[PDB]
Amino acid sequence: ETLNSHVITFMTRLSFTAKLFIYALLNLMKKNGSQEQELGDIVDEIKLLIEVNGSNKFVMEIAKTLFQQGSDNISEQLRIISWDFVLNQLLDAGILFKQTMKNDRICCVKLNISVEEAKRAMNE
Amino acid sequence: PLDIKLILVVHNLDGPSIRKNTFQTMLSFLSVIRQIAIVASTDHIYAPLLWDNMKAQNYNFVFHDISNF
Amino acid sequence: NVTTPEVAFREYQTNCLASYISADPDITPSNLILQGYSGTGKTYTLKKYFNANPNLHAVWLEPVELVSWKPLLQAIARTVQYKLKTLYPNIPTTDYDPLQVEEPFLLVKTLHNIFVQYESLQEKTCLFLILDGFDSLQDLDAALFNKYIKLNELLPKDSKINIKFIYTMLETSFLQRYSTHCIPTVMFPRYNVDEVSTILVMSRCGELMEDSCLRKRIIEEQITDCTDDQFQNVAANFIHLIVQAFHSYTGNDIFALNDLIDFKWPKYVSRITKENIFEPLALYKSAIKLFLSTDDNLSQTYDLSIISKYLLIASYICSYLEPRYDASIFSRKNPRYLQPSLFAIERLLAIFQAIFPSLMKANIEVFQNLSELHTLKLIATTMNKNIDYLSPKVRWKVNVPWEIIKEISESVHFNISDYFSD
Amino acid sequence: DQVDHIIDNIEADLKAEISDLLYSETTQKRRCFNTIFLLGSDSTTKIELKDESSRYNVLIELTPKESPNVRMMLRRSMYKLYSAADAEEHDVSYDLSLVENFKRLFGKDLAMVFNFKDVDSINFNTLDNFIILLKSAFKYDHVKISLIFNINTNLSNIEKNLRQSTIRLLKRNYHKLDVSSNKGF
Amino acid sequence: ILTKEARSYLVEKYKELRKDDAQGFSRSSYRITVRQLESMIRLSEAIARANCVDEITPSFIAEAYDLLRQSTTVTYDKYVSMMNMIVRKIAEVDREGAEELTAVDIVDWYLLQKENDLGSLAEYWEERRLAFKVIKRLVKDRILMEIH
Amino acid sequence: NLNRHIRMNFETFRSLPTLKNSIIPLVATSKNFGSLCTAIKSCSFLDIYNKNQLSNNLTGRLQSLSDLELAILISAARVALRAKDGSFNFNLAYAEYEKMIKAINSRIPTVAPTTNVGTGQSTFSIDNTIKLWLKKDVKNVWENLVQLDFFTEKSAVGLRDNATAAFYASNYQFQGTMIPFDLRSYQMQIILQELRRIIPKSNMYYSWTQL
């Protein structure tokens, strides 16, 4: 107990939104080989990942909720629900590390933990 | 009454301190005073860049060449 | 158990606010975030809620009239202590120096000292401290919102009196930075056009039906004595008219409209007659000459002189012409849009002596008018305001747009379309 | 002698016209300070005020040097006007509170006037924020304010930089009074 | 021939077809020269030969000009034609000092206008609903400002 | 329903106090037992609550804008798209807006006959039929936008870490002050692609969101 960490056993418990965010970030890291992504770019990638799967009723449910908690009455969100919230829940937790620019589409983002352990966490 | 009660003279009015625009404006509003005689000199060839018509009006500069090398 | 008031367009917000706020300090959460952009009446719906429920107790602060967190703390202290002195005149008290606090912890200690003496209270009572516009503090930092969130915890839990905050903020780009706290919050969306008109008319009829100018012109014209409704009709009609004619220009504001109305009401009154009062149509067709221009402006043939005209018109030439080309296109033998690049002295003098119509070599009036310009902030320096007039690293750049350049060129009769080529 | 004669003539003319236009403009709104622009102003024109007993008439002058930010403008102005209230009067927070406490602390109601000495060089975002700040002072009714803009020139230059929503606050009652030694000769 | 005073018209119009082009600073047009004016003449003449009508009338010049210048919702051209006709009508009523104009008066104005529309009464009921859609659309748009 | 709302919260937020903040009003708002039972059976109030919580983050703002604001916005986004860095001046936005309006007028049949009934003076020649706003007025809409945060300065540190660095940055005599209003290179906050996904196609400018 004085050696083992928890970041793995933690990230295996985050909200599905958070895991989606991290997995998208890893796809970006390996796609651009830069280990540095732009926040809005990550949003675009999340849109990708949601739409690459077909119009499957289950993808339909995901799209619906993740973009509006049901209730078609209010819908058509630009960026996913809780996205600000989950971003912060990551950032303050020391996992994610972000610079400070009030422009929230070209601000940088970097993983503090190793990419490897994160990937492994995604694998469980 | 109109008589000189102090004579101030500035060496190198383009000095690294006097040329500071704050110092320049202070000396302008100063030189507005009649009972003082203002006489100075510079070295910077760009001396006229220092004063607008406001500061010139304050100074009423009259120029004289002195070249002794 | 509380009387929820009614507001024309705050139904949900009124209900949820009365739900997040009551007499019982126990079921009342610590903080609260009335969020929304300027023009949604937060400062008004909140007031019209409190005036409906007078049994409770609140304090009203104006974070914009204050500047920093230091005066903020001091004002909080003084207002709280005075509010309590005026809320229970019987209890003896020792007022603590509200100008003594200068640190967020000093505030907590002071409040503890203030509350420990009120322990002779008959029941747990709340005290709602309203910060009206915690966003607009001119010295905001990341580390202030939480600094004020956490005061609930530091203070004792079983005090006879319970301080509960109500923050007000806008620019959701700010509230987002503090989502994870999950503090309860209400949002006020901006209004649509129709409801804007509704609020505006029901708020300004009392101003316009009884203003001085209209009532004057009543007797100043044929009397045509009539009931109050006729003035209601004409005022509301003018309101719908101005809003439906300037909406696209003003957005969904309520203040901008409350400015246009007063700027365009007197003249509109002047353009009424004996007949049009029963005819809004011809009234409009007559007063038209104002409904179609803001006239919110209260190209000048600048006083500057010939040498100044040429100085400026040459100092504009390297907003596109880098020194790579000038010695070509000007020898003695699009970036029109983008922000201008930086000159350097003695290049300005170069192009000047070039395009001045051997005629002139004196440079006393030249530099004289140069300093004139720099005082007019038409060719400002990127560097400081005092050492520019030396020759250290220093760059000069024009701060006049291109239309005044056209003007100066045509007036001086020199042409400029040449030197720009693409 | 004839020079100084005409000089004092024009000087008294300017003082007279500005003192005249400063008052008598009873604008029934009475919730927005009246503004006095000085077209082509040299920015050196001194100003006088009515003595006007039972109400202090405190002049306030701000230089583009005095204006690093909003807070220090506010504090310098507050200190200046408090010192003036003292000189007229014979512990106080350098803030807006001094306004409303003013009556209680000095008896007579207040009427200040602001003289931005040389506006063209002041960073207009700061001045704008400061004016929006001042706007809050209109909830006390024992004070009234007035602004004296000493624009070097080009009223269009000013109305190019400020927030239009604040222009629409100044435009309540303005007066494009000119101050130029050179006008029709 | 150009005997119709469209001639004068055409001149003025060509002016703006130069003005709208603002190459650099009063620098010559890429796309339009006087040859384009001669072209406008020919395009007009050709539209006339199309309609089998001599003596080009200004509307012809108008069509030639707009054709030369290029480079819910229902069929877009129909909507914009409705817009143009209705706006001309309202402008004429403005000039003539006629009292007012109502939505149903405009719908009957079109009743007047498009009778060669033909088809069936069903069509008239449909085209009427379309007209009301369009007028309320303009209302929702900012083209004509409503009253009362 | 309540089960579904709980599951939604779990998948997205995975945080109890959030759901608690959602519940507090729904319960406390009711007046009679039957009404509260109805609510918790349908949980409709959670819908309005989600909505209002969501009301004006970035989409509600976009929806609460009139025509001309939307036009300035779209055109400015297109200008940002052209340039690589996205940095677009105000003048560029205005020029692009002007040529867009020129286009919108252009695709109108533009009939301007001159003749009429003898001595009619009728048959007016209205052709532009879109009130292209001037430079002098648009600045209002530009300020409205830039304070509705659809835009931002080129590179602006929003809020410093603490009051120390914030104060040390307020003492900074900035120079963007010196550059005029219509040159501050504002970068974008909502990119054109997204912009195409939200503006309801009913709007008469929808055909310009897409390039």
Ligand SMILES: Nc1ncnc2c1ncn2[C@@H]1O[C@H](COP(=O)(O)OP(=O)(O)OP(O)(O)=S)[C@@H](O)[C@H]1O
């Ligand atoms: N529902 C309403 N009924 C009546 N008047 C309203 C209503 N909503 C807004 N108003 C008016 O609009 C004004 C705007 O109030 P504010 O709360 O100051 O606006 P704002 O959104 O708070 O911007 P501020 O003042 O900078 S916080 C109110 O003072 C009322 O006069």
